[PDB]
Design an enzyme around this catalytic site. Structure first.
Site, PDB file in Angstrom:
ATOM      1  N   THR A  55       0.861  -1.212   0.000  1.00 30.53           N
ATOM      2  CA  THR A  55       0.000   0.000   0.000  1.00 30.53           C
ATOM      3  C   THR A  55       0.888   1.252   0.000  1.00 30.53           C
ATOM      4  O   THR A  55       0.609   2.212  -0.765  1.00 30.53           O
ATOM      5  CB  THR A  55      -0.946  -0.028   1.205  1.00 30.53           C
ATOM      6  OG1 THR A  55      -1.424  -1.368   1.344  1.00 30.53           O
ATOM      7  CG2 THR A  55      -2.090   0.942   1.046  1.00 30.53           C
ATOM      8  N   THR A  56       1.919   1.253   0.840  1.00 32.56           N
ATOM      9  CA  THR A  56       2.842   2.402   1.000  1.00 32.56           C
ATOM     10  C   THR A  56       3.643   2.570  -0.292  1.00 32.56           C
ATOM     11  O   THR A  56       3.945   3.719  -0.659  1.00 32.56           O
ATOM     12  CB  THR A  56       3.756   2.243   2.220  1.00 32.56           C
ATOM     13  OG1 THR A  56       2.948   1.975   3.363  1.00 32.56           O
ATOM     14  CG2 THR A  56       4.589   3.481   2.466  1.00 32.56           C
ATOM     15  N   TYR A 118     -12.894  -4.410  -2.377  1.00 28.92           N
ATOM     16  CA  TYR A 118     -13.911  -3.864  -3.315  1.00 28.92           C
ATOM     17  C   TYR A 118     -14.833  -5.009  -3.752  1.00 28.92           C
ATOM     18  O   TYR A 118     -16.035  -4.960  -3.425  1.00 28.92           O
ATOM     19  CB  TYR A 118     -13.275  -3.074  -4.470  1.00 28.92           C
ATOM     20  CG  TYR A 118     -14.235  -2.817  -5.602  1.00 28.92           C
ATOM     21  CD1 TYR A 118     -15.451  -2.189  -5.382  1.00 28.92           C
ATOM     22  CD2 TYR A 118     -13.966  -3.268  -6.879  1.00 28.92           C
ATOM     23  CE1 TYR A 118     -16.370  -2.015  -6.407  1.00 28.92           C
ATOM     24  CE2 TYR A 118     -14.863  -3.077  -7.918  1.00 28.92           C
ATOM     25  CZ  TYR A 118     -16.076  -2.460  -7.682  1.00 28.92           C
ATOM     26  OH  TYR A 118     -16.967  -2.309  -8.715  1.00 28.92           O
ATOM     27  N   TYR A 142      -2.600 -10.498   5.035  1.00 26.15           N
ATOM     28  CA  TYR A 142      -2.720  -9.061   5.353  1.00 26.15           C
ATOM     29  C   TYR A 142      -4.179  -8.755   5.664  1.00 26.15           C
ATOM     30  O   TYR A 142      -4.989  -8.782   4.738  1.00 26.15           O
ATOM     31  CB  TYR A 142      -2.179  -8.249   4.180  1.00 26.15           C
ATOM     32  CG  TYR A 142      -2.140  -6.753   4.370  1.00 26.15           C
ATOM     33  CD1 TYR A 142      -2.256  -6.152   5.621  1.00 26.15           C
ATOM     34  CD2 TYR A 142      -1.919  -5.937   3.273  1.00 26.15           C
ATOM     35  CE1 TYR A 142      -2.174  -4.773   5.768  1.00 26.15           C
ATOM     36  CE2 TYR A 142      -1.839  -4.561   3.405  1.00 26.15           C
ATOM     37  CZ  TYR A 142      -1.965  -3.981   4.652  1.00 26.15           C
ATOM     38  OH  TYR A 142      -1.884  -2.621   4.759  1.00 26.15           O
ATOM     39  N   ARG A 147      -9.344  -0.683   4.922  1.00 23.61           N
ATOM     40  CA  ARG A 147      -9.085  -0.489   3.468  1.00 23.61           C
ATOM     41  C   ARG A 147      -9.893  -1.495   2.643  1.00 23.61           C
ATOM     42  O   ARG A 147     -10.362  -1.115   1.561  1.00 23.61           O
ATOM     43  CB  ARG A 147      -7.593  -0.632   3.150  1.00 23.61           C
ATOM     44  CG  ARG A 147      -6.699   0.417   3.796  1.00 23.61           C
ATOM     45  CD  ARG A 147      -7.231   1.816   3.574  1.00 23.61           C
ATOM     46  NE  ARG A 147      -6.290   2.866   3.932  1.00 23.61           N
ATOM     47  CZ  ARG A 147      -5.400   3.402   3.106  1.00 23.61           C
ATOM     48  NH1 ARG A 147      -5.303   2.980   1.858  1.00 23.61           N
ATOM     49  NH2 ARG A 147      -4.625   4.383   3.528  1.00 23.61           N
ATOM     50  N   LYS A 170       0.019  -9.954   8.936  1.00 20.79           N
ATOM     51  CA  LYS A 170       0.102  -8.489   9.080  1.00 20.79           C
ATOM     52  C   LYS A 170      -1.271  -8.031   9.562  1.00 20.79           C
ATOM     53  O   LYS A 170      -2.204  -8.046   8.747  1.00 20.79           O
ATOM     54  CB  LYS A 170       0.483  -7.793   7.774  1.00 20.79           C
ATOM     55  CG  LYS A 170       0.583  -6.280   7.924  1.00 20.79           C
ATOM     56  CD  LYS A 170       1.081  -5.526   6.708  1.00 20.79           C
ATOM     57  CE  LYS A 170       0.951  -4.030   6.929  1.00 20.79           C
ATOM     58  NZ  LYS A 170       1.088  -3.245   5.679  1.00 20.79           N
ATOM     59  N   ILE A 209       5.359  -4.345  10.285  1.00 22.87           N
ATOM     60  CA  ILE A 209       5.495  -3.970   8.856  1.00 22.87           C
ATOM     61  C   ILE A 209       5.115  -2.488   8.801  1.00 22.87           C
ATOM     62  O   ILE A 209       3.949  -2.183   9.007  1.00 22.87           O
ATOM     63  CB  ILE A 209       4.659  -4.888   7.953  1.00 22.87           C
ATOM     64  CG1 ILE A 209       5.182  -6.327   8.009  1.00 22.87           C
ATOM     65  CG2 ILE A 209       4.628  -4.359   6.531  1.00 22.87           C
ATOM     66  CD1 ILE A 209       4.172  -7.369   7.589  1.00 22.87           C
TER      67      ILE A 209
HETATM   68  N1  LIG Z   1      -8.592  -6.363 -10.173  1.00 25.50           N
HETATM   69  C1  LIG Z   1      -8.217  -4.949 -10.479  1.00 25.50           C
HETATM   70  C2  LIG Z   1      -8.183  -4.700 -11.996  1.00 25.50           C
HETATM   71  C3  LIG Z   1      -9.507  -4.740 -12.762  1.00 25.50           C
HETATM   72  C4  LIG Z   1      -9.336  -4.050 -14.114  1.00 25.50           C
HETATM   73  C5  LIG Z   1     -10.439  -4.292 -15.114  1.00 25.50           C
HETATM   74  N2  LIG Z   1     -11.697  -3.641 -14.686  1.00 25.50           N
HETATM   75  C6  LIG Z   1      -9.195  -3.996  -9.778  1.00 25.50           C
HETATM   76  O1  LIG Z   1     -10.252  -4.460  -9.284  1.00 25.50           O
HETATM   77  O2  LIG Z   1      -8.922  -2.775  -9.708  1.00 25.50           O
HETATM   78 NA    NA Z   2       2.614  -3.379   3.055  1.00 26.88          NA
END
Ligand SMILES: N[C@@H](CCCC[NH3+])C(=O)O
Ligand code: NA
Ligand SMILES: N[C@@H](CCCC[NH3+])C(=O)O
Ligand SMILES: N[C@@H](CCCC[NH3+])C(=O)O
Ligand SMILES: N[C@@H](CCCC[NH3+])C(=O)O
Ligand code: NA
Ligand code: NA
Ligand code: NA
Lengths: 313, 308, 312, 312
Positions: A55-56, A118, A142, A147, A170, A209
């Protein structure tokens, strides 16, 4: 299995692991000279491992060809002097499998694996994800729910710990979660610089870390090796507060530019802390002492127009 | 008038991406799903949204699928590419390629995992807002960062900002609609109330993948708390694990997608597949996509693929 | 019957332009300039375009750029011109993937070269083409001067047994053209300075042309209005100029001089020097500016107008 | 000073193996088989390896596969052999990115071909090479039989002004070799059937070899222990067999027969037929199995033992 064992144990013994900043040229390409100087400074001040494109390190902003190159470069140039842990994790299992097998083929000592962010999945899906990469070599799991927006629950960590390639965790949830794992013999690195002192001495964490080790690697080495030091920990708190007032790595990117060890070049969507905070940073450096911070150049405030923001690079 | 065409849509389907057993896209199955959406009154499609597993695509296959959808369906439905990213570079390149393929608009999330400052978030959106009609996507449950009203109000002054896909809830939807900002609910179990009580234009829907006709009815034919109560068990079933685990499982049971999952998604377990058969019978099979009798399927019917 | 007509639509084309890909100053595609070039081709009677052929610098594209340009061309122009994607490769894996994606974008046909650099056996070459020939209407591209491997007649004849084989873009010469056309195989000349004689004396259907990028009206006249040795002789000085260095160096320089592309080169191509750019101004005056694409006065341009990009 | 030493470290190598890339049954790299092949080369006196050369099927690799194989070879073998990445391309963008990535990961040198298929001018060729030559020790690859463009002496003389130009992999023949070696430019023969005479009579330093994949010890003896026309003559039938179809069809077939690689081909390559595999077993018997890589008895193999991969 005997080599796999020694390889995993060589990760478990590390107390100071730096989530190294990735510095850029004015056009947004990697500054490998600046990067090499940063890694050499970590080694000379007692960093035992580096995360490459964590991330860093803005792994999230790299193309896979840049990220794999930086892992191979770090192994080739520094692999004999520091443990190299590639951040080959992904919210996509396909990307995690390809990046991890490539990283290990080029000799990285371990892999950092986040749970899918996500595109969050079920507990069964989380296990399925980790099981595709755990067999490839020494792995740090991790957990950073602030996040990813998804806690890796203890049931998943305990199941993954059955695999001898699970080096440890981590952990960012806090010292109660750390203790739950360390009491059962699972190796834990704190992912929270402002908790890592208490985690190390009071809750059984092996070490940290660290983001803060990018700036004061010697003081973080002292914090992890030389016993309880509540005074030193208290003296670093204003610096750790400043480093996280905006999301990491905005702080460390701004600070390393001010210390003259990285160019003032940001890959979007990161932008520097504003003038008032840069003035605060010069005050923090004066209170601790410039000699404890990386680099030799007098700390600068920098002008707003000294910063370059790159979207297309 | 590009942007006004987007602003009028009430049913936008977050279309599921179906797979062949080796994990490649099943374009025949995909075309059949989009055709069914058009026939049942879907007015727009998000290509490679969260439901469409854009997060599991290469940019190669994501931009291909947008171009394919424009070629096959662009005259019959509005094609919104999910060209958002946590990386500004990726978002710039994906958005300009998507618009070059002929997509009608872009969906743009705030940076996830690598979250940024308000100033950085503004800088990110400004790189893509000039390229064409943009729907701003706020889903703090997934990004772990709320796009605050301050940011949406400022972005909304940009004539390329079509509106917001809002997942915070109906109080947030109302805060925007009362100030003249166009809002699609991102929450199927809130979209009825959003549309009829809180000024939402409509829904960007997961559930329309299963019951497109009933979701069009919910958005167009007036307030209907009975139809909304009738759909709640199905919506509760679809979100018991993170989207798209529910819709992937359901479309496999209905026979319109193969039971092939790209990791890290895995299907709902046997007990939940048995409950789905009961939910279909209670609502009526005629309302669900496909002609095949609904099957429970065995655990060993499901193909989980990591390497595709 | 459904596929038969798609292939027959390609077989009837006489003027196919191998369209130039223009760039913005940092080496990214200039889609505005590209759209203007394609519109000019349509307005002047070009009936097909090859997207990212040798002239289009497909060899310098990433596959994502290449497939995007095909989809862009279909979406914007697919109802007004036949769009043939150059989805060929020296790698069978790349050719399969690119060809599938191209047809998924709605392209009307595919252009397929035999493997260049990594040359293979006759059996390997047939294996290569058989992986893509089933996907849609296909033109087979023989250019031994670039591939360093002749596609022999025995291979063309075997491929011809597949209804999807539309025809051959042939560069060996008019004797090889006649060997195919006298057996009912459709042939486009790939050689601008042979295409007149190919068309009128050797049964070629038409041309897949570089020169049509500059004078599309004159190339249409050459392929449609019958034998015209006078017009062919009038074009020969321009055709000699365009091929004095390897294509597309000539066409890239000329389109910059005519002001319809920016003077931006993707390496390893660099412009013709000032001596040749001065000759080009004289060639335009002799033929007449009205026959050339664009409305701007032809310029010589300074050496420093030309931008050479490696990191594109 | 370090750059002069790094370049001289490539210039001193006499036996460089263009190593074959072996595959698993699904077409992915067989890294276990690859590691065994490299180990066998080191044990029999190979001093350098080209990674993903023509013989290594770099032309059929994705860049992530190609860069991985370079980094893997440096990590596992870089202290025991010089690792030269084939980071060349017909695209200057591809060559720049691949080369800087290969050097960042510790490869000792780069092999750079002139642009193939998309051939450029002399000025364009120079511009292409100047983008990569500054990055580290470079071998310029002249193979006009595959590129269909001779790299002329004026280009080599100009590049030799740069201290990173290690030398030339030359395939034109012994007259061209001598035009460079007489001026003190380092040359490796790219032609196994010429490399003996090139080494002893025309000043070549050594060979970048296909045949060393099969008989590394015999090739080392040819390059180190003086003129041996008898040994060179003893190898000629094997070299004739290896190039009867385009490389690497022969070496791919032979390594499958010796049991050191799986009988798996990436298209567009297909194995030599049954009669040729019978001829190979006879060649191995005449020379002696103990000189060929591997411990297993040479097998003819059945047609249906071979797997051909399109989607690799
Ligand atoms: N897995 C990555 C790349 C996806 C790229 C295509 N939409 C993400 O979720 O950001
Ligand atoms: Na890291
Ligand atoms: N931005 C994407 C791709 C990063 C790939 C390199 N680490 C992500 O965060 O998943
Ligand atoms: N430069 C490579 C890749 C080009 C791919 C896009 N057409 C080649 O000529 O094969
Ligand atoms: N097939 C393409 C790409 C190869 C890229 C990896 N070496 C070429 O031969 O140029
Ligand atoms: Na969506
Ligand atoms: Na062409
Ligand atoms: Na080679």
């Amino acid at each position: 299995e005997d080599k796999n064992r020694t390889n995993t144990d060589d990760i478990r013994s590390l107390r100071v692991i730096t989530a190294i900043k990735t510095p850029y040229l004015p056009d947004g390409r990697f500054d490998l000279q600046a990067y090499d100087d940063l890694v050499n400074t970590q080694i000379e001040n007692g960093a035992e491992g580096v995360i490459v494109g964590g991330t860093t390190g803005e792994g999230q902003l790299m193309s896979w060809d840049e990220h794999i190159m930086l892992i191979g470069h770090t192994v080739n140039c520094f692999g004999g002097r520091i443990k190299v842990i590639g951040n080959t994790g992904s919210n996509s299992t396909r990307e995690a499998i390809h990046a991890t097998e490539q990283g290990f083929a080029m000799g990285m000592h371990g892999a950092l694996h986040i749970n899918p962010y996500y595109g969050k999945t079920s507990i069964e899906g989380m296990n399925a994800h980790f099981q595709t990469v755990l067999h490839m070599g020494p792995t740090i799991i991790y957990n950073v729910p602030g996040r990813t927006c998804q806690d890796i629950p203890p049931q998943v960590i305990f199941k993954l710990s059955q695999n001898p390639n699970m080096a440890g965790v981590k952990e960012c949830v806090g010292n109660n979660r750390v203790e739950e794992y360390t009491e059962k013999g699972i190796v834990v690195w704190s992912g929270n610089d402002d908790q890592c002192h208490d985690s190390r001495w009071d809750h059984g964490a092996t070490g940290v870390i660290s983001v803060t080790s990018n700036l004061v690697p010697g003081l973080m080495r002292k914090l992890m090796f030389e016993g309880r030091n509540s005074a030193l920990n208290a003296k670093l708190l204003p610096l750790m507060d400043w480093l996280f007032q905006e999301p990491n790595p905005i702080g460390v990117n701004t600070a390393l530019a001010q210390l003259g060890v990285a160019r003032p070049v940001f890959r979007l969507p990161y932008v520097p802390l504003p003038l008032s905070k840069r003035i605060e940073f010069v005050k923090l450096v004066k209170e601790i002492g410039r000699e404890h911070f990386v680099g030799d150049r007098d700390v600068q405030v920098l002008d707003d127009d000294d910063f370059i923001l790159i979207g297309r690079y």
